[PDB]
Write a protein that binds this DNA or RNA. Structure first.
Length: 78
RNA sequence: GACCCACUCGGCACCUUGGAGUAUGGUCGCAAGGCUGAAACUUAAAGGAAUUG
């Protein structure tokens, strides 16, 4: 049920429920310095997501059948 | 008893002599406002559009 839920770790107190992919999102990554997450679904459109409130930045589109896994170069934010 | 003709009485009947418009800078509601999906996202599938590609 095409959503991404972010919980904390000291409490797990349901920090951010978010949506908008129109298919089951199947890969998540989190920025190396805890500032930006990357959600990716099977509608060929990844979304770079802001963190403080959950504002989407670029709902960008590639890989013309389906994204299967996204991962983070953990040195810079690429 | 019936039929005809005249008369007569009573019947169901018959025939002939403020609104209309228009106008509204007011009061109140309202089609008002655009390819949907679709936004903080220029983003999918599926559609309507116009399509002699």
């Amino acid at each position: 049920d095409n959503t991404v839920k972010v919980f904390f770790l000291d409490s797990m107190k349901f920090y951010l429920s978010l949506y908008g992919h129109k298919l089951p999102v199947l890969s998540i990554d989190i920025s190396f310095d805890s500032k930006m997450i990357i959600t990716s679904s099977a509608d060929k459109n990844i979304k770079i997501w802001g963190l403080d409130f959950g504002d989407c930045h670029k709902s960008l589109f590639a890989h013309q059948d389906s994204i299967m896994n996204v991962k983070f170069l953990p040195q810079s934010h690429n």
